[PDB]
């Protein structure tokens, strides 16, 4: 969903400040008949303030839609507030405003930051600065890379000197939860975006080969790993390609070749190199020459440890 | 019910200020034996302050009555407070006090304003002025016409550039809910009491013909439309006539003839013109000459849109 | 129970101030082994402050007793606070302290005052003075008579220009509720302790003959009436006699002879005159010469009113 | 409701046998469009068998009606079965069938008989004959008078050598319960329809004067007494008159003048004598000359007994 | 789903008899690894009997599928029994067996027949013959047309001399309920497959224009009407075309042109005539010349009736 | 627990028949004071029949024990009945009786057979013979090997032409459930105790390497495989050794060396060969020379399949 689904621009003294929509202003708009030349303009509900443009009805769930979001939850408000607090720290101009709001973001990512922010144990609850950083990164207004300290969140299922592995709990979300109850995904952020020693890389591969053998280790090129079911890589390839493709309108970090699943590293390199989707994806469905194992015996050690 | 069922006059420095009754003072009075020459005077419960006049017992529900109100709900207090806050802004005199309190008002309307007032998203929650306006209008102390911004409330089921349609949720009320669970009524206020363009009138008629074909479009002459079941117009005609009739003690806006149901426009014009109830109502039960459709094809467009 | 079951004396600057016991200090004492020469002294639980004298264990309920009170309820605390706040306004001396605390009071009466005090609608919630008056009267430290404004409370089931009738809800109490679920008693206080006109006395007798025909109208001589089941007068006679009898250690208002039940007026007059319990009570169990009805036709009017 | 609301006639070998409707056949009919010349004919739902005539829709509750019965309860079936079992024992002819089914009966009475019938302790559960008698009487096909053994039922609140007093529990019914929760009525049947000794009449009057002083003792002339609130006699007078009036299409037992409320005895005698409703009812609203008490001191004895 | 998803053929004395699968045999098969040359053969679970062919896994719901059926409900068993009881009455041969079982049927239709069959009020509960007829028709083994007496079922919302209208309650189903909670569809069967008088057709059109104005009246050519939302006709056109198209492997009753929605009659005639899907469907999305209303004033009568 | 914890021998005509204990006879015995020379004799509760020997108190759970069984569940009765029905089919002699009853059996195994037996879908519910076979095997009175058809039961998580894999649900048991909620074990029985083709062995190894990589594939030498957590093999080695060791009072099937976990095959062979526990177990905790993979690429195929 676009950032325009949560807030609207109000110019305040040489600069724009962003404001959250009331779920009711949205509800009103969903029932509004609008002229085709006003679908993009902000809607006025008269009773509940400003509402998003009618052309965005699809993003909100109605009886006739479950492909949108649950805007009538407090969470919606919280996520909208989060976005505004970050955009306000930018002081945007009349030339960028629309470009900023038209940016599509991961709502689940924003909800997870709220879960971090509101938790007194989480550091984001204390560092207004780390919170703004984590948010700007998530909403596309930062050149910084997401790392552990600024991760979207979730439950830590493994931590190392170099990495932190999280379990994405998208099933519990209020705003836009995943409907499939078999959904399971993990994210592996770097604690520090610097070079990692072979020993700390070996610890992470052991945990993945042992505790997540049915998962493919991939990435979306933004700096962290994504652990997903093998019966899911195909969809991750499609979405990743789409994004890359939108370069006609864009760097991609392939990450450590000893950690990424062989085929995904292929599918991706063949993408950065230029090849077509069909060419790239074919590299995804073929048994490739097993490259020399960089860390042999990892699974065997674990097994023996477990046995003792 | 009269305004005297919620508050009592206390003269404070050249002016009367109104005060809410405690539900218990009312409960006490309901069990009081009063001399026939004191039925109109305010009752003193000794323990819970002043209570309404004994002649008003009928307005409150007891085991022996369900035709009154549920005064032992917080809502009662809230509605009473609402009324007082508006009457106090008037600074009434010893000559008008009784006339004001003897005014009969729609309790459901007042409860709905409280629902608006207490909602932080609703503008009334913020504009003490819009709130006083909406309330003065509702309690008969304003020459202004109810429009969207000051509507009684309910759920917005359709909004236009010219109108806002509301679903009256009287079934959920605390103070005096409607006992029939098949009750359904809508209200269509004008967003702005000025002339409306044929296109915006056409949008509203389409929504009514399509989404509310089983409803009759009428009005009570106070400026907005009332959408009610056809098996209900008879009662709306009776009540409307009664009111008009009380002119022997009074303007009536017939509204847009292209929107009002043909027969109701007849029944009403025949009322403003002077005719008797029997004469007027007969115009309600007869198949009349289908006046030329001002907007033909409206229902067909909708159907085609739906099909696509 | 004695006032000593709720508070203990702490001399503070030429005067005693009273303090509430913690239910736990009481619980501790109930499990304390005490020397026979300390049963009357205040007990020290070390951990929860001062506790009542061990000789009062009977007043508190334990697994081995239901004839006491439920001291482990907030109510206990509230009632104890109520008592202290009143005793503190007296500034008692080292000569009266024990006499005051050894005074036995009606706990149900004190709980009911708390129910009045904590209710924002009740005047006691506002007049710290009326509250202290109502409490001093209840705990035996006032020469004033209980009247409506200072009544113990309950639910008003009938109000007049002269009286207020209350339903004693002892079944709902927290501190010391009545165990019999068939218990029903009413109290009729005078709104003003002055002479009442025959018409206002007639209204009250009508309500009693009609709405409470199965009840005997009596009094305990302290100024108000007590409405109790006829199968209960015997016990009220016993308790009333006991009290009177304790004159060897004492005025009795027989109240309006047109309102009190004939036999009780007899039983009581024969008591003030001096006669023995046996002599008095015999007057209670004998069909006496029906004295000329002071207000004939009262029941018939009501019946006719009801019929219309 | 008419007997035709539960069963339909099926001629079986020189005689008609009656059959119960399925609640669904009724539900089907309620949604059927019928020609005006078939409103009286039995409706065929095709799927659920025969249903009552469309002209009887009013008798059944729909979303648009609560003035009918709850035909979708097992009770409906049970009551319908009860009626059929009795009508079948009659073996009705083609000349009487319609006359029988057009007979209006008290549904609450029939439900109560089912409650008796299904109770293994109740004698009706055992005597198929007493059950048929009690039912034939209730549905108008018997010259016998209802007495205790064949009463409609309810809870016995007092029994004598001559009478049995029942509390009508119409509030608990499934088929057609009374909506007012303040409803209270009693019925006093004779155990044996013969002359009663003054002592047994005196016992019954004592119980009524003492335990039911707020009730008027009346009758509907069919042989038993009806104990109802005084604020209800007016309605009982109206209904009783209506019935009597339908003599133009009829004996009335005024019962013991020492038990019936003076005014009702008047209102009724003035009815049997011929007078008009207005003339009769006026005798109901006037304080009449207190006829010499046939049993003086009854209330006083009770009071004294209670006191001991 | 195919009939092969519920039963398996067991040749018994010159003839095949069909047998129900145990849900557990199915559960076992879902977890079975099968050779590619056995996907069509019946699977043997050893412990729970025979199970459907592995090539049918898709038809059953697993954690990885909600596009199938809930085979672990009693309903599954019931529906399977229903099918077997009908197929057994046919006595199928070794040449037809596979052809019969490969037939795809509407599961919701079969569940609804079970709901009819198990209801003692429904005639199917009594006529083993009507039940077998209704079932053979539903499973494709009958040349007879579905009519009211043999309809799939649902709730009767309107009945006529010629038709019966049903509300399809697919949302309540156990075996394969519709996941969209906004689903609403009606079916109008003919009570008797013969010619209907214009008056009975007029009654049905009135009910549709008034009570179902937002619905399109269509058919699937098998003899009855289908009432569906206008935003659904497109999908009904697609499915209907697919079926017709499978003629390359087939009669279509267009029904009364005065009842079918104008465009659907077009889309369909253009299909029977031979035209392509694209050609046919285009006739669905275009405002056509309003053919002369065969029954004008129908909606107006209803309105007036309602008003009275 | 021994078979003597469920039944007692009653000689009936040249043969012993076994009888179930009532849980109450057991409860009685648990509270019995017995002479040290009667701990082995059957106890007589007088009121509830015969009970097990007092020396078996340990086997039953009391407030002072959770290391026993929950004999006060219906299950206990069922399991006891199961055992008796099997022992009765043997017709045991006075020389074997004690030897039979002193046999220790797996209670969880017996409960699972009851779960199979009582399930109408399970074949044991139908073949009294397969049931007796499955039971005799479980209680040590059969030379036959447990295979799929006679397995203890559980939930089938994978089935092949040669094997059937079950999930042991010991956490749900009534009689003697496993207290650790992290418990997970699987059992792989042979469908037919004959030689299996390499292809069917390859399918089973693929499923284990992929879906159960964290589990060790072992056996207890009685003919089937046991899938257990690696952090559990140590305990399985101990128990297996104990049993073998009791040969001083005994064949062991090591099963397919391509399926059993390398180390367990070692630990076990070193046991059959004669070595000591210390010698055997050491082979369990050492990284051994990876024997040539008999089926290489199995995990890779699965991964690719999943990806497609």
Residue with tokens 């309003």: E290
User: Which residue in D210, D213, D233 is closest to C307 by CB distance?
Assistant: D233
**Taking the mean position of all CA atoms in its chain, how far away is CA C10?**
27
Establish whether F303 is an annotated binding residue: no
Residue in E116, E110, E124 with CA at minimum distance from that of residue E153:
E116
* Two structure tokens written together for C117: 């005090």
Q: What is the Cα–Cα distance from E200 to B86, expressed in whole angstroms?
A: 60
Establish whether D107 is an annotated binding residue: yes
**Taking the mean position of all CA atoms in its chain, how far away is CA C230?**
19
* Helices B198-211, B298-307: inter-axial angle, 10-degree rounding: 70
Residues E135, E65 within the same domain: yes
Residue pairs between chains B and D whose CB atoms are closer than 8 Å: 6
| 3-state SS assignment for residue D267 | helix
* Neighbouring subunits of B (3+ Cβ pairs under 8 A): A, C, D, E
Within 13 Å, how many C-alpha atoms sit on residue F56's CB side?
24
Q: What is the Cα–Cα distance from C292 to C296, expressed in whole angstroms?
A: 9
Establish whether D220 is an annotated binding residue: yes
Establish whether E68 is an annotated binding residue: no
- Contact call for A46 and B148, based on CB within 8 A: yes
Q: What is the Cα–Cα distance from D275 to D281, expressed in whole angstroms?
A: 10
Residues D211, D134 within the same domain: no
Residue in B119, B112, B4, B116 with CA at minimum distance from that of residue B54:
B4
Q: What is the Cα–Cα distance from E60 to E84, expressed in whole angstroms?
A: 19
Residues C175, C301 within the same domain: yes
Q: What is the DSSP-derived secondary structure letter of residue A65?
A: B
With residue A51 as reference, give the H or E element that holds it. strand A50-51
Residues F140, F157 within the same domain: no
Decide: B251 and B221 in contact? Cβ < 8 Å: yes
Residues B115, B188 within the same domain: no
* F122 interfaces chain E, CB cutoff of 8 Å: yes
* Neighbouring subunits of C (3+ Cβ pairs under 8 A): B, D
End-to-end CA distance of chain F: 50
Chain F contact probe: residue of E47, E51, E54, E71 with most F CBs at under 10 A: E47
* B230 interfaces chain E, CB cutoff of 8 Å: yes
CB neighbour class for D101 (10 Å; exposed up to 12, middle 13-18, buried from 19): buried
**Taking the mean position of all CA atoms in its chain, how far away is CA A125?**
20
CA distances from D261 to C296, D21, D234, E114, F285 (A): 19, 43, 13, 61, 102
Residue with tokens 């007969």: B282
A208 Cα to chain E: minimum distance (Å): 23
Q: What is the CATH number of the domain that holds C4?
A: 3.90.1400.10
Residues of each annotated binding site of A for ATP: 106-108, 187, 220-222, 226
Residues F84, F161 within the same domain: no
Residue D293, phi-psi category: left (phi > 0), alpha (psi -120 to 50), beta (remainder): beta
CA distances from A38 to A186, D188, D296, F288 (A): 42, 78, 91, 74
Decide: C240 and B70 in contact? Cβ < 8 Å: no
DSSP string, chain B: -BGGGTEEEEE-SSSEEEEEPPHHHHHHHHTB---TTSSSSPEE-SSS-EE--GGGGGGB-BTTBSSSB-TTSHHHHHHHHHHHHHHHTT-B-TTTHHHHHT-B--HHHHHHHHHHHT-TTSGGGT-HHHHHHHHHHHTT--SSPP-GGG----EEEEE-SSEEEEEE-TTS-SSS--S-TT--EEEEEESSSS---HHHHHHHHHHHHHH-TTEEEEE-SSSSEEEEEGGGHHHHHHHHHHHHHTT---------TTTS-HHHHHHHHHHHTT--HHHHHHTTSS-------SSTTHHHHHHHHHH-
* B285 interfaces chain E, CB cutoff of 8 Å: yes
* F152 interfaces chain E, CB cutoff of 8 Å: no
Q: What is the CATH number of the domain that holds A208?
A: 3.30.428.20
Q: What is the Cα–Cα distance from C174 to C182, expressed in whole angstroms?
A: 18
CA distances from E185 to A142, D29, E135, E158, E205 (A): 51, 21, 21, 14, 17
Residues E137, E1 within the same domain: yes
Q: What is the Cα–Cα distance from F193 to A135, expressed in whole angstroms?
A: 63
Q: Which long-range contacts (CB under 8 A, 24 or more apart) does F225-229 make?
A: F225/F187, F225/F188, F225/F255, F225/F259, F225/F260, F226/F185, F226/F186, F226/F187, F226/F188, F227/F165, F227/F185, F227/F186, F227/F187, F227/F188, F228/F185, F228/F186, F229/A306, F229/F184
Residue E19, C-beta contacts closer than 8 angstroms, at least 6 positions apart: E7, E8, E9, E10, E50, E84
- Give the helix ranges, DSSP H, for chain D: 23-30, 74-88, 97-101, 107-117, 128-138, 198-211, 233-245, 262-272, 277-282, 298-307
- Contact call for E33 and F121, based on CB within 8 A: no
Residues of D in contact with E121 (CB under 8 A): 22-25, 48-49
Residues of each annotated binding site of A: 106-108, 187, 220-222, 226
- β-bridge pairing C7-11 and B50-51: unpaired
* D266 interfaces chain C, CB cutoff of 8 Å: no
Residue with tokens 């109930």: C30
* Two structure tokens written together for C25: 């200090």
Residue E218, phi-psi category: left (phi > 0), alpha (psi -120 to 50), beta (remainder): beta
Residues B155, B303 within the same domain: yes
CA distances from F42 to F10, F54, F71, F98 (A): 11, 8, 17, 12
Decide: A76 and A23 in contact? Cβ < 8 Å: yes
Decide: A31 and B159 in contact? Cβ < 8 Å: yes
- Contact call for B231 and E306, based on CB within 8 A: yes
Residues D110, D224 within the same domain: no
Q: What is the Cα–Cα distance from E255 to E259, expressed in whole angstroms?
A: 8
Establish whether E106 is an annotated binding residue: yes
Q: Which residue of A has its CA nearest to B130?
A: A47
Indicate the residue among C124, C144, C164 that finishes a domain.
C144
CB neighbour class for F145 (10 Å; exposed up to 12, middle 13-18, buried from 19): middle
Residue in F261, F274, F190, F267 with CA at minimum distance from that of residue F230:
F261
Decide: A42 and A52 in contact? Cβ < 8 Å: yes
Q: What is the Cα–Cα distance from B164 to A33, expressed in whole angstroms?
A: 11
* Neighbouring subunits of E (3+ Cβ pairs under 8 A): A, B, D, F
B66 Cα to chain D: minimum distance (Å): 10
Residues A91, A222 within the same domain: no
Secondary structure in 3-state letters for E47-113:
CCCEECCHHHHHHECECCECCCECCCCHHHHHHHHHHHHHHHCCCECCCCHHHHHCCECCHHHHHHH
* Two structure tokens written together for C243: 């009290």
* F123 interfaces chain E, CB cutoff of 8 Å: yes
Q: What is the Cα–Cα distance from D81 to D175, expressed in whole angstroms?
A: 14
CA distances from F306 to A89, A232, B235, F211 (A): 46, 9, 68, 12
* E63 interfaces chain A, CB cutoff of 8 Å: yes
Decide: F216 and F273 in contact? Cβ < 8 Å: no
* E47 interfaces chain F, CB cutoff of 8 Å: yes
* D234 interfaces chain C, CB cutoff of 8 Å: yes
Indicate the residue among F128, F144, F160 that finishes a domain.
F144
Indicate the residue among E144, E178, E197 that finishes a domain.
E144
Report CA dihedral (D126, D129, D134, D138) to the nearest 10 degrees. 130
- Strand-pairing partners, residue D11, are D16
Handedness of CA A104, A107, A111, A112 (dihedral sign): negative
- Give the helix ranges, DSSP H, for chain C: 23-30, 74-88, 97-101, 107-117, 128-138, 198-211, 233-245, 262-272, 277-282, 298-307
Residues A171, A226 within the same domain: yes
Q: What is the Cα–Cα distance from C201 to E248, expressed in whole angstroms?
A: 102
* Neighbouring subunits of A (3+ Cβ pairs under 8 A): B, E, F
| 3-state SS assignment for residue E256 | coil
The count of other CB atoms within 10 Å of the CB of residue E95 is: 7
E236 Cα to chain B: minimum distance (Å): 11
- Give the helix ranges, DSSP H, for C212-289: 233-245, 262-272, 277-282
Q: What is the DSSP-derived secondary structure letter of residue A183?
A: -
| 3-state SS assignment for residue C118 | coil
* Two structure tokens written together for C259: 């309102």
Q: What is the Cα–Cα distance from E224 to E205, expressed in whole angstroms?
A: 15
Residues of each annotated binding site of B for ATP: 106-108, 187, 220-222, 226
* Two structure tokens written together for F106: 């797996």
* Two structure tokens written together for D260: 């019936």
Q: What is the Cα–Cα distance from B45 to C127, expressed in whole angstroms?
A: 16
- Contact call for B284 and E306, based on CB within 8 A: no
* Two structure tokens written together for C282: 């015999």
Establish whether D108 is an annotated binding residue: yes
- Strand-pairing partners, residue A141, are none
- Contact call for A32 and B121, based on CB within 8 A: no
E257 Cα to chain B: minimum distance (Å): 18
* A27 interfaces chain B, CB cutoff of 8 Å: yes
User: Which residue in F122, F191, F203 is closest to E33 by CB distance?
Assistant: F203
- Strand-pairing partners, residue F188, are F165, F225
* Two structure tokens written together for C78: 């509230």
Domain count, chain D: 2
| 3-state SS assignment for residue A194 | coil
Q: What is the DSSP-derived secondary structure letter of residue A120?
A: T
Is residue D109 flagged as an active site residue? no
Decide: C101 and C92 in contact? Cβ < 8 Å: no
Q: Domain range holding A22?
A: 1-144
* Two structure tokens written together for D219: 């009758």
Q: What is the Cα–Cα distance from A276 to B284, expressed in whole angstroms?
A: 72
* CA geometry: angle B206, B210, B211, nearest 5 deg: 110
Catalytic pick among D10, D109, D126, D224: D224
* A64 interfaces chain E, CB cutoff of 8 Å: yes
Residues D140, D181 within the same domain: no
CB neighbour class for F225 (10 Å; exposed up to 12, middle 13-18, buried from 19): buried
Residue with tokens 């009273």: C18
* A208 interfaces chain F, CB cutoff of 8 Å: no
DSSP string, chain F: -BGGGTEEEEE-SSSEEEEEPPHHHHHHHHT----TTSSSSPEE-SSS-EE--GGGGGGB-BTTBSSSB-TTSHHHHHHHHHHHHHHHTT-B-TTTHHHHHT-B--HHHHHHHHHHHT-TTSGGGT-HHHHHHHHHHHTT--SSPP-GGG----EEEEE-SSEEEEEE-TTS-SSS--S-TT--EEEEEESSSS---HHHHHHHHHHHHHH-TTEEEEE-SSSSEEEEEGGGHHHHHHHHHHHHHTT---------TTTS-HHHHHHHHHHHTT--HHHHHHTTSS-------SSTTHHHHHHHHHH-
Residues of E in contact with F191 (CB under 8 A): 46
* Two structure tokens written together for C266: 């007899």
Q: What is the Cα–Cα distance from F257 to F265, expressed in whole angstroms?
A: 7
Q: Which residue of A has its CA nearest to E182?
A: A63
Q: What is the Cα–Cα distance from D175 to E173, expressed in whole angstroms?
A: 29
Q: What is the Cα–Cα distance from E177 to B63, expressed in whole angstroms?
A: 46
Decide: E87 and E3 in contact? Cβ < 8 Å: yes
Report how this structure was experimentally obtained: X-ray
Q: Which long-range contacts (CB under 8 A, 24 or more apart) does C254-258 make?
A: C254/C219, C254/C221, C255/C219, C255/C223, C255/C225, C256/C196, C256/C201, C258/C201, C258/C205, C258/C294, C258/C295
End-to-end CA distance of chain A: 50
């Amino acid at each position: 969903a676009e950032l325009a689904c949560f807030c609207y621009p109000h110019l305040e003294n040489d600069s724009y400040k962003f404001i959250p929509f009331n779920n009711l202003a949205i509800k009103a708009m969903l029932t509004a008949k609008v002229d085709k030349k006003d679908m993009d303009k902000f809607y006025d509900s008269i009773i509940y303030g400003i509402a998003p443009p009618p052309q965005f009805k699809k993003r909100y769930n109605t009886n006739d839609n479950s492909r949108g979001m649950n805007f009538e939850t407090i969470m919606f408000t919280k996520v909208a507030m989060l976005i505004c607090e970050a955009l306000n720290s930018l002081k945007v101009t009349q030339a960028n405003v629309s470009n900023v709001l038209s940016r599509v973001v991961s709502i689940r990512h924003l909800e997870n930051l709220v879960i971090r922010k509101e938790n007194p144990q989480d550091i984001l609850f204390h560092s207004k600065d780390l919170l703004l950083k984590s948010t700007l990164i998530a909403i596309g207004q930062s050149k910084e890379i997401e790392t552990t300290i600024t991760a979207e969140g979730g439950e830590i299922v493994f931590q190392n000197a170099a990495f932190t592995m999280w379990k994405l709990t998208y099933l519990e979300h209020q705003l836009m939860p995943i409907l499939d109850q078999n959904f399971i995904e993990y994210k592996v952020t770097l604690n520090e975006d610097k070079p990692i020693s072979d020993v700390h890389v070996k610890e992470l591969v052991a945990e993945l080969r042992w505790q997540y053998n049915k998962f493919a280790v991939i990435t979306h090129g933004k700096g962290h790993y994504r652990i997903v079911k093998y019966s899911s890589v195909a969809n991750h390839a499609d979405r990743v390609y789409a994004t890359f493709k939108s370069n006609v309108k864009n760097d991609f970090n392939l990450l450590d070749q000893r950690i990424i699943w062989q085929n995904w590293y292929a599918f991706t390199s063949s993408m950065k190199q230029g090849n077509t989707l069909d060419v790239c994806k074919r590299l995804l469905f073929q048994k490739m020459k097993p490259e020399k194992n960089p860390f042999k015996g990892l699974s065997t050690d674990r097994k023996m440890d477990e046995v003792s």
